[PDB]
Structures are given as structure tokens and as C-alpha cells.
């Protein structure tokens, strides 16, 4: 079967420019689990991008959490790039602010 | 509550430089464990007895080969991805309830009977794939010794609170309405209930968003819609294990 | 030894209902899926249904999806196939199953005619007899397929040659089975062949003498 | 579903390879399928040759064997023998109880000997005048090619209102047969001094004649 992925981005603590802090791209529900995802700062992938273990939740589907370490200013825009058998084309998430 | 459960994956066509089976460990809502095809050998995680970690290795070892050889008993092409379910709950009753469940390319098909000692599902591919593993010396005592006595044991054997920081925050949505939403960062343990009110009545369906942080704590938000100029009549309600009682989060000022 | 043994085939109307059985043997019986498959006369095979080990999972082809109920009781070691609204293109061989990969044993199949034509039992005529001799039975005017002949109820079966019937523009079936005896044996053999048409119930034994 | 498509037919010679292909049988990215063939003799159920896209059944020759890429899958019978003459189908496995059945291909073995037709005509019985009707009846045997022309005569006049024919079809030893109806009243019985089946099969007819 086919599941396509569900895309969360979300900072680990509350933003505040000037002070460090981590980018998370929660991307979860997929099937199967071949997958690409990236970090974009301004549109342009991020290179110094951990992410956890392949794993996968009660319903079998497939989630990885992509993060990175950042300090947040007022100009830098942050997404996260998505690919997937299931995706016509890639998804691109942004980190939205004023959520 | 309290679990160990085994999260096995096997793929018959791994992407280049990835392992074909790996397998992680889990005390709740926690990894402890992790094994993988490529390197062979059972390893701890976060936090986490020399002659345990080479028990481990021996049994996922053999897993992986009882994976792999699932594949075999299938033939043709696949691609395969066959994943398992192994461990344990603890219930407020204080019962243990054993977990042994399969899926073949994400749908359940076999499972472990306790009382056959087999393997068995539905279909064809599920006997045919049982059928290889009763092949395998001691496999399905192995699977029944730690489904009913081991995993209990051990969830015994292996056996902290930061509350969350909330923020609830309103955006333009689209003419004439605006969208709330209430957010939890940065907390443990996973469970956190999220509820409004708009002038101290309920509203919306609690349902949101939750996901991991890469320290061990998680995330969660929930969104509700409402009707412009009406923001300032919405809060939000959070109930956590760090907070010693539901903490009333109002909108932010600016 | 794997067995398996269709029944419940019939002639029905158009909108009637009829109900297959397949007995199974000879392996464990509630570890293995199940499954029918049909064939209507010189046309390919097609999937009908199939269920479960258990029985807790059903599957069928669109076709018959929403008509057809596929079930089993393991106790008894039978799969069932509850057949409703049936129409003319129902008309096939329906062959049991045992689902598996590596290997495949079917029924010998159960044959199910949908028309709104009545059955008629056929009237049975001696061809007689003239080396060697040839005599046979004259099966007439019988609807529907299938009818069979044996000769000396099974104890001759060496020079035995039941012909494929014609289909008669009268809409009926008709065919004939021969023998070739020894000339010798005329006076002090009998011959006598044994008719089943069971859509009618009709079974006749027929003595075939000299002239 | 849907059927999976394959020839018709397909014919070769003794100790010939051929090819059966069957088109339909790709799978979608995160399923997958198991391609089955079956080989089917006249009257027969159908048998498994072919299992997991190659794999053989203990028994089945070696002569047999198949393969499977992307949207299609094969069927190759080397060192064609007499015995291949069948239908052979495809099947395709795509988990959890489903099946789709390709339509089915016509096997046919060329260059086998000729074989001339065995006529055997009998006349009405006593017991079928009895009760006012007369059959005549022509059983046609042991012949091949599959193909005959049959020619009721009465005292040498064409018969052509009350015959009934069969199609030829294969027997068990690979050879046809066939049988022709004559239908008349006891009085057209009676009114002539013989009637003659004659069966004509490539190029020679063989007559058999019956007298009231």
C-alpha cells in the first residue's frame, strides 16, 4: 500500500531572534518508507541536519524526525522539503511563525 | 502506561547504504534499543550490563536472518517491507498483555497464536512465511517463551516530569475569520490535553497536532477557527503531568 | 492425499438462488485460505471469491460482488458459495480451490446453468450391433449439458467412445456412445449402457441386443 | 478486476521453443503480485506449471518455465511435444485472497501425422420407429487434421433439411471426432433404398451406407 506523509515544522522551544534554538521537520504516516526530506533556509538546503532512526507507530506507518540547531533572526525564512513515491511533487512546509 | 515492544523492519530492497532489517527497543515511550543489519550488533540509546547487550545481539541476529528468510518463503520480486510488533503492557489491571503482530508492505497479515504456538493469518503469504519460520530450530518456543514469561520478566526488571511552555497565538486566516492556535513546547511525558473556551464555554474538538523533539521531550499544538474581532473572548486550557492542575493560557498580547 | 469434491451444481432460472459445497480432505483444513474459480464453456478462467483461513476475511471479484457469499465451516471442513440474482453470464464450471503459495489442488469442478429453459430428461434408444462390432446408445433431446454414460454400470470401459453432443437448433441436447466389441462375444455378453442426466433426475439402463 | 491480456493462439512445431506472453502484470509501487501459470487439457481441471513468476512444481518438466518484468510476464515451452497441445492461462497473485486470470492462450503442436476419419453409421431403432420418429446417426473418429465436410445422401439425392453436425473437437489421443444427425420420419425412412453418410477430410471421402 500507499501512505502519503503527514508534515509538521515546529521550533522546540518558543522563537525568539538572536537566541538559539532547534528546528524539528516531524515527518510521520508514511508508506512506504523510502523517503526524502530536507531543512531550507531561504529556499536552499541545509547541510548540518541530523535526524532520528526510521521508526514506525501502531498503524505501521513510517515517521522520522529531521532537526536541526539554529538561531532565528527577523529575514530567515525556514521549511522543509518533502518527497515521496505518493507526492506528484515535492511538498515544502514552511516554518510558520506567527503560529 | 508501562510497555516493551520491539519495532522490527525488514525491506527485500534496501536503498543504497541503508540496512535491510534494524530494529528498535522501547520502554514506553522510550527508546532504549537499537539494531541494525549492517552493523550487527544490539546497542543502547539515551541514557541507557555487558552480558545483556550480548544476549540481544544473539536473538536480533537470528530475527534478522527469520526476516530475511520471510522473503524467500514469498518469491517473486516485492519489493517487501515486512515489519513486526514483539513485547509487552503492563494494565492498571496488572495484566500482562503480549503484543506479536506482522504486516507485509503495511497491511497486518500474520500474527503469533499462544495457544497453536504458531504463526498464522488469513491468507496464503501468511502460512507460506509461518511455514519457513517453523522451520527455524526453537524459533517459535523462543517467540512463546518471551511473549508469555521473558518480556513480563523483564518490563518488571526495567522499570522524570518537565511541564510544557504554552503559547496561544492568533493569525489572519481568511476574510472575515482568524485562526487560534494553542501550542505545548517542550514537554515530557508525551500525554497533554489541549482545550477552549470562548467566554468559559467549550469549544472545538480537542483534537491536534503532537510530535517528538530530538532531546526526548515533545511538541504539541492545536488550532481552532473563529470569527474575526472575536479572538479576545478564546483561551486555553492544558492538562500535563508537570502541572500540578489545568493551567489557563491566555492570548498573546502583541 | 489432497482432496476436494464440488457440489450443488444445478440448472436455475434467472434471479434464482443456488448454494455450492466443497468437501475437503486430506490436509488441515482451517489453515488454509479457499477459493472458487469459474470457467463458463470454452471461455477463460475467472476468480469468483475467496476467504480466509479463518473465515473473518472475504474477497470477490466485481462481477459478483454483492450476489455471492463466500463462507466455511472448518468443523466440517467445507467451503460454501451462496449464490443470489443469478444471470446467464453466472453459467460456468465452478471449481474449488485450496489457496496457497507453491502449490494449487482444485476440484474437479461442479457445473451451474442459468436459463430460463426447462430440463428435460432424454429418451434413451439402442444403436445395435452389425472382426470386431460396433454398437451404442442413442441419448435424445435432453436439456441441459451434462449427461453421463457408462457401459455394464462401469465393468466395460476398453473400446468405449462417448461423443461431445450436438446442440440441436431445437435448443436440446442429443450424443451417442459406441462400443467395439468382439463379433464372438454377441451371443453370450450382454451390453447395456447407464444414463444419468442429473439436472432431471433422469438415470435409464439401457440393454443393447442384436437386431 | 480485469483480465490480463495474452494470445489466442500460439502454435509451433515438435521440438520447437515458443512464448506465451501475458500483459497486465505490474504492480504498483508498495504492492507487489505473484505470477502463476496454469496449463489446461480439454475436459481437465487446470493445472499449476508455473508458480512465484518462475518457480516449477515438483513433477512439472523442466521444459516449462517463466519469467516476470514490469508490466509483463512469459511463458516458454521448450522441446514442444503433443502432449503441450492445451489452453494455458496466467494468474496473477496480488496478496490477501485476490486473483485476476489473463484470457488465456491456445497451444497448438503443428507437422503431426495424418490420420484418416473412422465412419460408423447406424440406423433407426426399432424402438425409435415405435414411437414415430428416425434417427439416423454418423459417428466420425480418429482423424487429423480437425476438419470435415459431412454429406447426407438418399439413393444419391443431397440431403440437407434435418441434419444436425457437430463442430470437430480433440479428442484424448490428440485426434477429432465428430458425429452428424440425420432426423426424418419413419415414412421418408421407409421411401428410399438407402441413405449414405459420406465424410470427406482432406481430399478423400469415406462412405458408409445403411438400407431399412
Given at each position: 500500500i500507499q501512505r502519503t506523509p503527514k508534515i509538521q515544522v515546529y521550533s522546540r522551544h518558543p522563537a525568539e531572534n538572536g537566541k538559539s534554538n532547534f528546528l524539528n521537520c516531524y515527518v510521520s504516516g508514511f508508506h512506504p518508507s523510502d523517503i526524502e526530506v530536507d531543512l531550507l533556509k531561504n529556499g536552499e538546503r541545509i547541510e548540518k541536519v541530523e535526524h532520528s532512526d526510521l521508526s514506525f507507530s501502531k498503524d505501521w506507518s513510517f515517521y522520522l524526525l529531521y532537526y536541526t540547531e539554529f538561531t532565528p533572526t527577523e529575514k530567515d525564512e525556514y521549511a522543509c522539503r518533502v518527497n515521496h513515491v505518493t507526492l506528484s511533487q515535492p511538498k515544502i512546509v514552511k516554518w510558520d511563525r506567527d503560529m | 502506561h508501562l510497555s516493551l515492544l520491539y519495532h522490527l523492519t525488514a525491506v527485500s530492497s534496501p536503498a543504497p547504504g541503508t540496512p535491510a532489517f534494524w530494529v528498535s527497543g522501547w520502554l514506553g515511550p522510550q527508546q532504549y534499543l537499537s539494531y541494525n543489519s549492517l552493523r550487527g550488533e544490539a546497542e543502547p540509546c539515551g541514557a541507557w550490563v555487558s552480558w545483556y547487550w550480548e544476549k540481544e545481539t544473539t536473538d536480533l541476529r537470528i530475527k534478522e536472518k527469520l526476516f530475511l528468510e520471510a522473503f524467500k518463503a514469498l518469491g517473486g520480486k516485492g519489493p517487501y517491507t515486512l515489519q513486526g510488533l514483539l513485547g509487552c503492557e503492563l494494565g492498571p489491571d496488572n495484566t500482562s498483555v503480549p503484543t506479536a503482530k506482522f504486516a507485509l508492505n503495511g497491511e497486518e497479515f500474520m500474527n503469533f497464536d499462544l495457544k497453536q504456538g504458531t504463526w498464522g493469518g488469513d491468507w496464503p503469504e501468511a502460512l507460506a512465511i509461518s511455514q519457513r519460520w517453523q522451520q527455524q530450530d526453537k524459533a517459535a518456543n523462543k517467540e512463546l517463551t518471551f511473549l508469555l514469561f521473558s518480556c513480563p520478566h523483564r518490563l518488571r526488571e526495567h522499570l522524570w516530569k518537565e511541564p510544557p511552555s504554552m503559547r496561544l497565538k492568533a493569525r489572519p486566516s481568511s476574510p472575515g475569520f482568524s485562526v487560534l492556535t494553542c501550542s505545548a513546547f517542550s514537554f515530557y511525558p508525551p500525554e497533554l490535553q489541549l482545550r477552549f473556551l470562548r467566554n468559559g464555554l467549550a469549544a472545538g474538538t480537542g483534537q491536534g497536532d503532537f510530535g517528538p523533539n530530538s532531546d526526548g521531550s515533545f511538541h504539541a499544538s492545536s488550532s481552532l477557527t473563529v470569527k474575526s474581532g472575536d479572538e479576545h473572548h478564546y483561551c486555553c486550557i492544558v492538562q500535563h503531568a508537570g502541572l500540578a492542575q489545568p493551567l489557563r493560557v491566555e492570548l498573546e498580547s502583541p | 492425499e489432497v482432496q476436494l469434491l464440488e457440489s450443488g451444481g444445478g440448472l436455475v432460472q434467472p434471479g434464482g438462488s443456488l448454494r455450492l459445497s466443497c468437501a475437503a480432505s486430506g490436509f488441515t483444513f482451517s489453515e488454509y485460505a479457499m477459493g472458487w474459480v469459474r470457467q463458463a464453456p470454452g471461455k477463460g478462467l475467472e476468480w469468483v471469491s475467496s476467504i480466509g483461513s479463518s473465515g473473518g476475511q472475504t474477497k470477490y471479484a466485481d462481477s459478483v460482488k454483492g450476489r455471492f457469499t463466500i463462507s466455511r465451516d472448518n468443523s466440517k471442513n467445507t467451503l460454501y458459495l451462496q449464490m443470489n440474482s443469478l444471470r446467464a453470464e453466472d453459467t460456468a464450471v465452478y471449481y474449488c480451490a485450496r489457496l496457497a503459495i507453491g502449490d494449487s489442488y482444485w476440484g474437479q469442478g461442479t457445473m451451474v446453468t442459468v436459463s430460463s429453459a426447462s430440463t428435460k430428461g432424454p429418451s434413451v434408444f439402442p444403436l445395435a450391433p452389425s472382426g470386431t462390432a460396433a454398437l451404442g446408445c442413442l441419448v435424445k433431446d435432453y436439456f441441459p449439458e451434462p449427461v453421463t454414460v457408462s457401459w455394464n454400470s462401469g465393468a466395460l470401459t476398453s473400446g468405449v467412445h462417448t461423443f461431445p453432443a450436438v446442440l440441436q437448433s431445437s435448443g436440446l441436447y442429443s450424443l451417442s456412445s459406441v462400443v467395439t466389441v468382439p463379433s464372438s462375444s454377441l451371443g453370450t455378453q450382454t451390453y447395456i449402457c447407464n444414463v444419468n442426466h442429473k439436472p432431471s433426475n433422469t438415470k435409464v439402463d439401457k440393454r443393447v441386443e442384436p437386431k | 478486476q480485469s483480465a490480463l491480456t495474452q494470445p489466442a493462439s500460439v502454435s509451433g512445431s515438435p521440438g520447437q521453443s515458443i512464448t506465451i506472453s501475458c500483459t497486465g502484470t505490474g504492480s504498483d509501487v508498495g504492492s507487489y503480485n505473484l505470477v502463476s501459470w496454469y496449463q489446461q487439457h480439454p475436459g481437465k481441471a487446470p493445472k499449476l506449471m508455473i508458480y512465484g513468476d518462475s518457480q516449477r512444481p515438483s513433477?512439472?518438466?523442466?521444459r516449462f518455465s517463466g519469467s516476470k518484468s514490469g508490466n509483463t510476464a512469459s511463458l516458454t515451452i521448450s522441446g514442444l511435444q503433443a502432449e503441450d497441445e492445451a489452453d494455458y492461462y496466467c494468474a496473477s497473485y496480488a496478496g490477501s485472497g485476490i486473483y485476476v486470470f489473463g484470457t488465456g492462450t491456445k497451444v497448438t503442436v503443428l507437422g503431426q501425422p495424418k490420420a484418416n476419419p473412422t465412419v460408423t453409421l447406424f440406423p433407426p431403432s426399432s424402438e425409435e420407429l415405435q414411437a414415430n420418429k428416425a434417427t439416423l446417426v454418423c459417428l466420425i473418429s480418429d482423424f487429423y487434421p480437425g476438419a470435415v465436410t459431412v454429406a447426407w445422401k438418399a439413393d444419391g439425392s443431397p440431403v440437407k433439411a434435418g441434419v444436425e453436425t457437430t463442430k470437430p473437437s480433440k479428442q484424448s489421443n490428440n485426434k477429432y471426432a465428430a458425429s452428424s444427425y440425420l432426423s426424418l420420419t419413419p415414412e421418408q425412412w421407409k421411401s428410399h433404398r438407402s441413405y449414405s453418410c459420406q465424410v470427406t477430410h482432406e481430399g478423400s471421402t469415406v462412405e458408409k451406407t445403411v438400407a431399412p
Open positions: - | - | - | 513433477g512439472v518438466s523442466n
